[PDB]
Amino acid sequence: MVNSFSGYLKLTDNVYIKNADIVEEAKKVKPTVVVNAANVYLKHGGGVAGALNKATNNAMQVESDDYIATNGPLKVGGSCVLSGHNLAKHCLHVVGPNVNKGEDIQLLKSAYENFNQHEVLLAPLLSAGIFGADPIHSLRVCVDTVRTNVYLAVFDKNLYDKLVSSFL
């Protein structure tokens, strides 16, 4: 079905990419699902998580603290579905491995598998940015793991250009 995502470059049958601020993208599109680059404690301090949470006026963090108090931490590679607040219907909080914590990069595939539970997503590259993985690798794992339709927002123009120009 046609959708309102605009200005994306088509990488594959199901994966699309754009140089964009995921906060502004979500505000404009109001997708069914926005993906957060979460950690196991749902402490949304920085990176994508800090930015999404700030855009919700801290409502994402309040909701997340109640989630953790009830359910305990997520697993690396795991996820939970919470409200999308003012950004989306739902937020899929996905924990990619954090290389700066020594976590095993193989868990990146498991992390992306969560996307297959949703027909359409707006997402960042998992484990990129402050999570320390190579974004070119993250894009490769995304393409090779996600089968549903995923619209990737890449914050940095230089990185976006490198991701497109090196894509096999």
UniProtKB/Swiss-Prot annotation:
Localization per Swiss-Prot or TrEMBL = Host endoplasmic reticulum membrane
Q: How does it sit in the membrane?
A: Multi-pass membrane protein
Q: How is this protein's activity controlled?
A: Inhibited in vitro by GRL-0617.
Q: Which residues form the Macro domain?
A: 2-168
Q: Which reaction does it catalyse?
A: Thiol-dependent hydrolysis of ester, thioester, amide, peptide and isopeptide bonds formed by the C-terminal Gly of ubiquitin (a 76-residue protein attached to proteins as an intracellular targeting signal)
Indicate the secretion signal residues: none
**Outcome of S165L?**
In strain: Gamma/P.1
Function text: Responsible for the cleavages located at the N-terminus of the replicase polyprotein. Participates together with nsp4 in the assembly of virally-induced cytoplasmic double-membrane vesicles necessary for viral replication. Antagonizes innate immune induction of type I interferon by blocking the phosphorylation, dimerization and subsequent nuclear translocation of host IRF3. Also prevents host NF-kappa-B signaling. In addition, PL-PRO possesses a deubiquitinating/deISGylating activity and processes both 'Lys-48'- and 'Lys-63'-linked polyubiquitin chains from cellular substrates.
Subunit: May form homohexamers. Interacts with N protein.
From the Swiss-Prot or TrEMBL record, give the protein name: Papain-like protease nsp3
Gene that encodes it: rep
**Shown residues within the full chain:** 1025 to 1191 of 7096
